[PDB]
Design a binder for these strands. Structure first.
Lengths: 176, 170, 92, 156, 217
RNA sequence: CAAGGUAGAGCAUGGGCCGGUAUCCUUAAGGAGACGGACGAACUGCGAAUGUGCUUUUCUUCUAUGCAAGCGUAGUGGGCGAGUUCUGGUAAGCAGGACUGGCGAAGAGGAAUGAACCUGGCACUGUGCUAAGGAACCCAAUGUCUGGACAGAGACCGAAAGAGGUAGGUGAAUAAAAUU
């Protein structure tokens, strides 16, 4: 496609992705009640938790309120795979469990292996709610080699919170 | 270290490609995110398109060759913010790349005027021949007329204590 | 889809027996009867059985009595009626 | 210290707008009201009967009862950390019909068609929900007509 | 006597003005605002020089009066009476208060200490902000170095920072010198003492004609 | 979808400071003035951001180890402090309000020490990693590059006013190296 387009002096820019990934970088214990409620609705509870969220106008206004606590951005397929394979897990209602063939078949009548799960999650938009709400929040370690500056500054200022765009993969890869 | 990037972008509303114009901007920055930040800054001040109505279509890095590390002369036009106002000026440097030239200016102004790197703006970078040089500083080095000896001593070994009768420096 | 699935789960869990409740009476004949119903509940989803088992655990005041005529008034044309309590005479 | 009369602190409120003094227009008197409509309170300072208390100015409620020249409207209010309903009497000169239900009523008109067909042909409605604005769309660009931008303005 | 200037330097309180609510206020010390050749036509005194504020504070009516005398005496001796015009731009409208207390304190029938502490009128001041023009001069172009030195002497009478600067403007018009000449030639200006009115193609024609016969050229 | 009059901006009704060309009125003074500059917590012609309420799950997102009418009964009714703002006062570790988190009733690691500041909320053990803050020695971990700076200075530290030394920017000259 890129060849055909360049061969007729035109640029193509794909649609923005359907989901962002969010990581809780610093402690919320002194934030206001309005902030605490917003973190609850995104299922974030302890430091170094990571979670996936629908890209949508409501979500983008929720993120604006909490941007001083969280790093966020977009995630390509290679990193999504390493996350699910190395740190993924699930729940039925109050029972926490490992992702196995029996448990997929039970929950989603037509997904049978962990590779089909990752494929649907990335490529099918209309099933995102069901597919996302099956996974538990990911529990990560602090990054290997530490943070370079005062993490509470914005990424533009040289810290660690805010919008890392196409480059969140680098933070997550040090935290798996 | 500093790098050079060129960012391209368009306007959008409730529907796509609302203007047929494309806008471009060359910038020296450390990474792509600091590049994209600058593009947003200039659009909002020279036009009035805020981020929610913009989309970046491309970011590209610009790189030279210089396999033999040949040394060249450059002139740079800049401004910076102080406590009073904004101060414009021009200075000349030598180096193996445009980025090598630009990193030396940023270091200079931080040393001489006590300014953080984000308050300095580059307006123009130009490569020059020997007849073009304006100020005094680099001309002797450009005309190839310099030799000098070493002022700093250098340690011979990593050991902390050594015998009195050994050679200590260089 | 999901919002319905969730609510239909809550409605069910609101009916079923709690299994961490027990009657306070030291009467061994009453405690026998509770044991039967308890073992039936863990092998069924039927709402009538669950309701009965929850009511055996409530206090004497919660098990308020009814008069014969009021049972008939509430029977609504059924043949068998069930009541966790004591049935008294109506002189009227 | 301050006082506590019925029209305390109403110097800005309860004053006419510039070049809009005088009595109300005919449309005010020819509007018909019904129980269950949503209505919106805005006091006219020139009319001295049937005025509500200034807490209710600019609030919207629901019509409970209709009389010759006045209406009873239901409101809710927090007092001592509990919710209380309040029944406010207002004259027809101090009210206007509310616009707050407008979009919902349009949506109901569309739903009312589908919900009938859903019995005949399908089994359940598609129901036409609203969705929040999604991600930024994709674009194909011709790449002539490039415009350059520069820090040419020195800003002395 | 008076309290020192540090007591009333910064703009702590809201403006407070002589009115029906505030009575028994003393007169300000400065009363005279224009000096030199007041009615000289705008064209005759092209150079403009100003004292400009780099601070946000209150200036007492006593300080303004001392500066007037200082600036005027210099220009009068050096420029001559007919060659200059000085204007002091700021007016002392704000009222200062004092909560007066006795020396032989500790015990009296008078209500002692911080009981009923609201003060009485004490004096007046002007309130000033950054980049404001405090004193302004117009003169002949020969008198730049003289006008500079006159304004320097005011700079020592006020708290904070102030700078002497030269303007782009013609006179006490608001017009840059380049533009003024371009409107003067081509007949568009009407003199009104220290300033000018610009003729425009806006009204009825018989008025336009009647204006144009009055132009400066 | 409503309501609002603060910050900014303005001086059209009311209060109110200084100066005015032509022209006008008298005087042979002064006054008025087609206009400019300066202003109000109890001046307004215009008007934000943040905050408040109403409807819609027929609207995203979360939700049972969750909410909870009703009944019975306790303690409390001297508060204090930080950040952002306000009123009285020359001010105050002073007196008095508003909003969002604390100490009270909160330990642990860090600011040498400190109720409230930074990191961050505690059952009991074991192995790894990071925060804030550090890395000659006291004391677990330290080095490198480029400019400035000589004062028993600085790393900890006061004003209006200034010359001297040195490093750079911009604008004027002159030039038989440059200089002002």
């Amino acid at each position: 496609s890129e060849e055909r387009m360049q061969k007729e002096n035109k640029i193509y820019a794909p649609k923005d992705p359907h989901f962002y990934a969010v990581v809780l970088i610093k402690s919320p214990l002194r934030a206001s009640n309005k902030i605490k409620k917003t973190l609850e609705l995104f299922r974030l509870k302890h430091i170094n938790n990571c979670v996936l969220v629908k890209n949508n106008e409501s979500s983008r206004q929720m993120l604006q309120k909490i941007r001083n606590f969280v790093a966020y951005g977009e995630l390509k397929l290679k990193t999504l795979r390493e996350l699910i394979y190395k740190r993924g897990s699930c729940h039925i209602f109050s029972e926490k469990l490992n992702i196995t063939n029996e448990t997929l078949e039970d929950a989603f009548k037509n997904i049978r292996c962990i590779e089909e799960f990752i494929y649907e999650l990335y490529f099918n938009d209309e099933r995102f709610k069901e597919l996302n709400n099956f996974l538990n929040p990911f529990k990560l370690t602090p990054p290997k080699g530490g943070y370079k500056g005062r993490k509470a500054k914005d990424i533009i200022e040289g810290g660690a919170v805010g919008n890392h765009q196409d480059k969140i993969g680098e933070l997550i890869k040090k935290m798996i | 270290a500093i790098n050079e990037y060129k960012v391209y972008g368009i306007k959008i509303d409730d529907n796509g490609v609302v203007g047929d114009e494309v806008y471009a901007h060359i910038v020296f920055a450390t990474n792509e995110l600091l590049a994209k930040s600058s593009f947003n800054k200039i659009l909002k001040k020279q036009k009035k398109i805020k981020p929610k109505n913009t989309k970046v279509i491309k970011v590209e890095e610009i790189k030279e060759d210089n396999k033999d590390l040949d040394v060249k002369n450059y002139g740079i036009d800049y401004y910076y913010k102080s406590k009073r106002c904004d101060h414009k000026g021009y200075k000349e440097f030598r180096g193996v790349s445009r980025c090598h030239a630009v990193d030396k200016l940023l270091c200079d102004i931080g040393g001489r005027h006590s300014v953080k790197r984000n308050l300095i703006f580059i307006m123009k970078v130009k490569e020059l021949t020997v007849d073009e040089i304006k100020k005094d500083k680099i001309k002797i080095f450009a005309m190839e007329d310099v030799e000098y000896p070493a002022y700093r001593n250098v340690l011979r070994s990593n050991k902390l204590f050594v015998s009195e009768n050994e050679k200590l420096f260089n | 889809m999901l919002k319905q699935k969730m609510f239909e789960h809550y409605k069910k869990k609101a009916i079923l027996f709690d299994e961490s409740r027990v009657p306070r009476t030291k009467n061994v004949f009453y405690q026998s009867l509770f044991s039967l119903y308890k073992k039936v509940c863990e092998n069924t989803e039927n709402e009538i059985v669950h309701k009965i088992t929850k009511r055996l655990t409530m206090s004497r005041t919660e098990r308020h009595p009814l008069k014969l005529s009021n049972i008939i008034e509430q029977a609504n044309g059924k043949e068998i009626v069930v009541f966790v309590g004591k049935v008294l005479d109506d002189d009227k | 210290v301050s006082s506590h009369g019925y029209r305390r602190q109403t110097r800005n409120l309860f004053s006419q707008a510039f070049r809009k003094h005088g009595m109300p227009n005919t449309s005010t008197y020819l509007t018909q009201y019904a129980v269950g409509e949503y209505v919106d309170i805005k006091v006219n300072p020139a009319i001295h009967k049937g005025m509500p208390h200034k807490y209710y100015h600019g609030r919207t409620g629901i019509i409970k009862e209709v009389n010759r020249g006045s209406v009873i409207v239901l409101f809710n209010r927090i007092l001592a950390n509990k919710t209380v309903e309040r029944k406010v009497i207002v004259g027809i000169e101090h009210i206007r019909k509310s616009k707050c239900q407008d979009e919902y009523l349009k949506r109901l008109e569309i739903n009312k068609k589908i919900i009938e067909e859903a019995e005949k042909k399908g089994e359940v409605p598609v129901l036409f929900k609203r969705q929040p604005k999604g991600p930024k769309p994709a674009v194909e660009m011709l790449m002539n007509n490039i415009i350059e931008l520069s820090y040419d303005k020195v800003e002395s | 006597g008076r309290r020192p200037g540090r007591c009333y330097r910064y703009c702590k309180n809201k403006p407070y003005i002589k009115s029906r609510f505030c009575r028994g206020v003393p007169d300000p010390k400065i009363r005279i605002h224009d000096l030199g050749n007041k009615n000289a036509p705008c064209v005759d005194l092209p150079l403009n020089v100003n004292l400009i504020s780099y601070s946000k504070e209150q200036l007492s009516s006593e300080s303004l009066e001392s500066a007037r005398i200082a600036v005027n005496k210099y220009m009068m001796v050096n420029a001559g009476k007919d060659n200059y015009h000085v204007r002091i731009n700021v007016h002392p409208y704000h009222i200062l208060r004092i909560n007066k207390m006795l020396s032989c304190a500790g015990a009296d029938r008078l209500q002692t200490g911080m009981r009923l502490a609201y003060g009485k009128p004490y004096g007046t001041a002007a309130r000033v902000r950054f980049g404001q023009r405090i004193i302004s001069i117009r003169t002949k172009d020969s008198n730049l170095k003289m006008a500079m030195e006159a304004l320097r002497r005011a700079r020592y009478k006020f708290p904070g920072k102030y700078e002497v600067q030269k303007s782009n403007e013609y006179g006490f018009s608001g017009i840059e010198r380049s533009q003024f000449e371009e409107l003067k030639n081509n007949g568009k200006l009407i003199n009104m003492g220290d300033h000018v009115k610009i003729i425009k193609e806006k009204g009825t024609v018989e008025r336009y004609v009647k204006l144009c016969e009055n132009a400066i050229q």
